[PDB]
Amino acid sequence: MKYIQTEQQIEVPEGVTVSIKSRIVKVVGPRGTLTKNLKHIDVTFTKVNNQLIKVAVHNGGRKHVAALRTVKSLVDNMITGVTKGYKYKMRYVYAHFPINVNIVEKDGAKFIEVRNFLGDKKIRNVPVRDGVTIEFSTNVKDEIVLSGNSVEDVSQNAADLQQICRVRNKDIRKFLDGIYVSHKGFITEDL
Amino acid sequence: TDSIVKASNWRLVEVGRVVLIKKGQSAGKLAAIVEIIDQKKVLIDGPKAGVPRQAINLGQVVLTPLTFALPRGARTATVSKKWAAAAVCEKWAASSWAKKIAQRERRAALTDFERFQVMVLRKQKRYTVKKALAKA
Amino acid sequence: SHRKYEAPRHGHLGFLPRKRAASIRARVKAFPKDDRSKPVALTSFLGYKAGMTTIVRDLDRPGSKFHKREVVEAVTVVDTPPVVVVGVVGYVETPRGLRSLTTVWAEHLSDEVKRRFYKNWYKSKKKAFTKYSAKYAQDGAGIERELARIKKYASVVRVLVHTQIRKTPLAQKKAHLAEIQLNGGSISEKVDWAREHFEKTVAVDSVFEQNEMIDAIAVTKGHGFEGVTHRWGTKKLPRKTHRGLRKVACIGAWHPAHVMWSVARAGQRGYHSRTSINHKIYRVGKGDDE
Amino acid sequence: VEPVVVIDGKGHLVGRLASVVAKQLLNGQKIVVVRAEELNISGEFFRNKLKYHDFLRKATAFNKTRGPFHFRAPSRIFYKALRGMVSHKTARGKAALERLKVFEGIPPPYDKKKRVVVPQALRVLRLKPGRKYTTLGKLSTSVGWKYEDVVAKLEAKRKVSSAEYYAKKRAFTKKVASANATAAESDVAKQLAALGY
Amino acid sequence: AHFKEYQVIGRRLPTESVPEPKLFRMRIFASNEVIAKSRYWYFLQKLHKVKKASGEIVSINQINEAHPTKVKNFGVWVRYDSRSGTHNMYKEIRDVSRVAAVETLYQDMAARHRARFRSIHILKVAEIEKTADVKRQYVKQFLTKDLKFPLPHRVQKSTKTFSYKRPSTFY
Amino acid sequence: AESHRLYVKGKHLSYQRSKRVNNPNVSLIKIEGVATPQDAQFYLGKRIAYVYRASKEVRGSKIRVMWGKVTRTHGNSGVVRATFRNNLPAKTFGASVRIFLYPSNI
RNA sequence: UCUUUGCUCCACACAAUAUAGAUGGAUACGAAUAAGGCGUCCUUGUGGCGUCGCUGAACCAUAGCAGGCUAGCAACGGUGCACUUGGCGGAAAGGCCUUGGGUGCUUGCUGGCGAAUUGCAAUGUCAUUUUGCGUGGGGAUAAAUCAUUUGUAUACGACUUAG
Ligand SMILES: [Mg+2]
Ligand SMILES: [Mg+2]
Ligand SMILES: [Mg+2]
Ligand SMILES: [Mg+2]
Ligand SMILES: [Mg+2]
């Protein structure tokens, strides 16, 4: 109904620095730097007290206002990922055929290589996105861990690795084999 | 270092906001937003200029950087008092916006003899300026 | 109503119009993509088809029934006397395509190649490149600045070569001349290679090697005006057909009230330019050799 | 008002610019449109791509070589939008379309010249914010235009040279405005301000 | 058109059986007196046994707003015929006069319900004299302390068709 | 000086017409700098000249002239109606014409 | 080039030819528009401070017989023409910048002489497009087609060859 003011607040922790020209955001923190482009959204930013940033929409409808809290969440997640980080743990599931997950370096691109998925002779290659770090977890059986600042990159890498291992021509209620995200959290949980 | 956010302030519609009227019977007079009726229209009053108290759409008006103190619903006498108190019209005449409006009006009111005089004077000023733009 | 029984179109529609080629020498409409790392080399060559003959060889195809067994195969022979490099020309990119800005030629053009610029050579003062050759003899003025222009510009470079037709048994005496792209790197190095090879010969051993796959681009054998049957492979109408059986019976429906372009019609067969790809080289043979 | 008017097509809506241009041409004005690859169309990219596929499907059936020709460059997409607004089967229409040129990018002479815009055809003024739009170069290269890259390279070159020109022009007008300010506070300048200059 | 408010007073025609009838009154929003008197009979035919032939009009008077410059909040009770059936509505309109409110109401109904003047009835228009009796958020939004808001994305209209600089949407 | 112009420039646009029928006895003129009839009123009654060239010299000149006058305003955007002694050829749609400042009422 | 002195470029001399339509100047950043331009400062950044916009209604140019003939003052500037130096520009560059002096004008200022009769207005003729004929100053000295012939071609044309 054309709300004339809607605002959301963005709290900024100690060591982080947020620089926002037109709608290009740059967050700088301990774990690194991130940057985003929001020129598709038509909102305005306002610094309050060096630890608070308001995001406002004027004379906006339901959709224009729904995008405001989205912007708020995106910048909050950039801050969270540059201070704490994001960590997605994935578990391998198999009944008979062991899935052999390795990392290879074709032309220095750092691909993930999945072998023997349901006895497949296909060698399935997932590229690692820049900003993501892979660790095969010792202290747990058949677990891989993708860590980085950008939750977008990390979760999309996880989705890629989970979707490359889909089963075809079978009942997926019985053939549950794959690589599934078990946990989504932070590198610095409960600091 | 610390956070920096380009503020991008722009001309809030608020009580006390001075607006220049753009089209209508006033058509160049100043008024003050006295109340806000909707997102698209406001109640104004410009008694020093002769603008009657009226509701008006914001497309008929141009907002200025000027702003003075008013309580909402203020009547024409209160507006006339606070206007002179805050010294609005001279603050407006001091702006280059108003100076440019006056330049336009004067250039229009010029006659042919004056148009001859200004070109003579412009040739003189050009001689001096182009002498100056050869030593530095 | 609908066709009683399905069958495919007789002929390929992407090989239309089945018309005579504009020239007897087919032109290369695409060269290999350039890697600006490898040395400077030609991407193509000019030769004359001599004939076909028979080859025996031991096949190496693990999984076949004829692995490590002798097979008989047909080959075609192309007489490839060395080409002679006379000229280069630079092409620069524009929003309307690649455009040539300059063509630099060699100082001395041979008779067999300057016969390509005449339709009546027996009655001529022969007066060809007689001022361009005097453009030399002042050290490099009108030539080196053209080459520098090609260097400063010209994302693409092509060398003009001609055939040594007099070395063949053909009685034509008129050399074929063609543009051949260079696919090395450093356009400066491309054009310096060209300048060094001006008036000089380039052999097929420097361009092609054995077991290499190549494309053959040629105008195909002409057969004149041919009927729809052999031109398109349509069905012969039965014996008791009035006014001819070697025809297409229906050439269209009532509506659209027109003959469609996709309907088989009589016309020229042969003398089309064709590109045939993936022909393996089985031998590159020298003529200074019994 | 000017002999020939150069319009920078960047930021403009295709149909609105075309309707302005067609009327200007018929009223006798010579026009040249540059940077047609950066023209904007209202509606999302898929929505306009489907519209172009629908027009691409349309062809003379007994011979496609004589049908509605589907020109793929942005300049010709604009020309198509525009001669539908001109009565091009008349000599008047022919003359008007001869008073028009359309170019991808800003080639020579028109690069050393002044460009103008049409505010009643500009996207930022005419479309609500939030309403999606597509870019003509992207559409064109999607439907078969081949030269989206070379124009970008040449335009980068053009912009480098143009910025090197604007630096000099700026530095010179600063000397000019300083000399004029010093020549102010003068009898002549005051007598001119009395008259509005 | 642009509306006006009319006090219309009417009276069944006198007889020997009953002189001095009961002098009914109505407030009518209309562009002129002819339409005002038409609607008076339209409604009085719905309420009472009378028509323009068996009745008369004793006085029609234009009512002007007593305070045309105070910004009022109105509530309007509307009956309107849809395509399927008939419905009732309560709508809150923030405006400076009853006639302006009724204009805005006819436009909002034409826009949001495709209802036409012939389909709309006005039951009453009432000034909400106490804030917090307002119940519609789209009016309650402009009843906030020291309210202020900008107008982003200004569009300046050009007298010419060619501009020699790129415009700006600053404000 | 460099400028010797004592006329306002204009363009012949069209004939008085409906969607499908024209009247060559009335022409439409666009005057530069005019964008409303209240400003186009200054030009009513003023003389108009269409000046054209020919290859033949008739009476000392290869330049021939059609004279007309502004009659009334057309529309809301400063276009005027003009009437010429002999109507305009209709190849002059888009052609330049001269509106003189006489007969003056200043 | 001796189809009887032809072809081409330049200069000016005259004729014809027409004009989709001059009549002071097409006056050059780029990007964004819920943001920018310009100045200035610094620790040179997504920086601070100030200012502008709200239209080109601007900027520049513009006075002189359709722009005459002359005298002087003040400054060493402005502008045009032809030369000249060095660059840059290939997207359709065919234009942009610059050096040096020569020459003319200068309305920056002050003066003198002249205009009339086109008769109360008549576009009151000032532009560019091509072509041709002349003079005078340079510059260069071919091909194609038919016919014959060939068969990598072919109904005929055409194509490919040779002489
Ligand atoms: Mg079927
Ligand atoms: Mg059938
Ligand atoms: Mg076959
Ligand atoms: Mg029979
Ligand atoms: Mg294609």
Side-chain angles (χ1 to χ4, degrees), chain B residues 77-92:
Chain B
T78 296
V79 170
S80 65
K81 207 218 294 185
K82 310 259 184 179
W83 185 283
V88 174
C89 64
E90 43 262 25
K91 228 181 295 194
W92 167 251

Side-chain angles (χ1 to χ4, degrees), chain A residues 116-133:
Chain A
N116 205 54
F117 178 73
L118 289 161
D120 280 11
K121 303 290 174 199
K122 194 167 165 39
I123 291 153
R124 296 172 194 195
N125 305 98
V126 177
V128 173
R129 307 193 176 259
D130 201 29
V132 184
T133 294

Side-chain angles (χ1 to χ4, degrees), chain C residues 2-6:
Chain C
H2 72 88
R3 194 182 185 162
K4 197 88 164 73
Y5 294 97
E6 310 284 328

Side-chain angles (χ1 to χ4, degrees), chain C residues 17-42:
Chain C
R18 278 163 200 263
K19 79 195 282 167
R20 302 196 204 144
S23 172
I24 196 168
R25 167 173 71 77
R27 35 160 187 137
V28 192
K29 303 193 195 175
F31 291 97
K33 184 180 185 313
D34 193 354
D35 194 347
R36 295 269 208 265
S37 309
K38 278 78 181 179
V40 185
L42 308 178

Side-chain angles (χ1 to χ4, degrees), chain C residues 275-286:
Chain C
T275 303
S276 188
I277 64 155
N278 286 342
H279 304 297
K280 196 183 258 281
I281 297 173
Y282 276 15
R283 171 160 293 185
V284 187
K286 308 304 296 179

Side-chain angles (χ1 to χ4, degrees), chain B residues 59-122:
Chain B
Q60 282 68 342
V61 309
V62 193
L63 269 62
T64 67
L66 312 188
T67 305
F68 62 106
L70 271 177
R72 48 158 273 277
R75 283 168 90 87
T76 303
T78 296
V79 170
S80 65
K81 207 218 294 185
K82 310 259 184 179
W83 185 283
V88 174
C89 64
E90 43 262 25
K91 228 181 295 194
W92 167 251
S95 68
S96 50
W97 185 352
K99 292 178 177 172
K100 194 262 181 190
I101 289 156
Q103 196 209 65
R104 158 144 41 78
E105 293 176 353
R106 178 54 174 156
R107 288 188 183 195
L110 285 187
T111 195
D112 201 58
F113 191 30
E114 292 150 49
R115 273 181 255 128
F116 188 78
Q117 293 174 32
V118 304
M119 55 176 284
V120 173
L121 298 164
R122 278 167 84 270

Side-chain angles (χ1 to χ4, degrees), chain B residues 6-133:
Chain B
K6 293 293 189 291
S8 302
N9 67 331
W10 62 87
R11 277 186 217 182
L12 307 179
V13 165
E14 66 200 350
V15 189
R17 180 62 63 171
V18 170
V19 308
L20 186 85
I21 295 157
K22 196 207 293 153
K23 54 189 182 164
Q25 208 163 251
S26 288
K29 294 184 192 158
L30 299 172
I33 295 170
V34 167
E35 201 150 10
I36 293 163
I37 303 162
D38 286 310
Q39 175 66 31
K40 269 175 175 272
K41 63 200 304 206
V42 300
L43 182 88
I44 59 164
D45 201 6
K48 296 291 106 174
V51 174
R53 203 183 191 217
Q54 59 179 297
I56 198 163
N57 178 4
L58 282 147
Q60 282 68 342
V61 309
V62 193
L63 269 62
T64 67
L66 312 188
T67 305
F68 62 106
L70 271 177
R72 48 158 273 277
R75 283 168 90 87
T76 303
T78 296
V79 170
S80 65
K81 207 218 294 185
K82 310 259 184 179
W83 185 283
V88 174
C89 64
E90 43 262 25
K91 228 181 295 194
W92 167 251
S95 68
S96 50
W97 185 352
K99 292 178 177 172
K100 194 262 181 190
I101 289 156
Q103 196 209 65
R104 158 144 41 78
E105 293 176 353
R106 178 54 174 156
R107 288 188 183 195
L110 285 187
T111 195
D112 201 58
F113 191 30
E114 292 150 49
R115 273 181 255 128
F116 188 78
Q117 293 174 32
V118 304
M119 55 176 284
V120 173
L121 298 164
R122 278 167 84 270
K123 293 173 72 142
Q124 296 167 4
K125 205 193 89 205
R126 168 187 98 199
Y127 198 77
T128 65
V129 166
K130 298 181 93 75
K131 181 176 170 66
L133 294 157

Side-chain angles (χ1 to χ4, degrees), chain C residues 207-220:
Chain C
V207 189
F208 293 120
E209 62 92 24
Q210 192 178 357
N211 313 291
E212 176 170 11
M213 305 298 262
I214 64 173
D215 312 338
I217 291 144
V219 180
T220 198

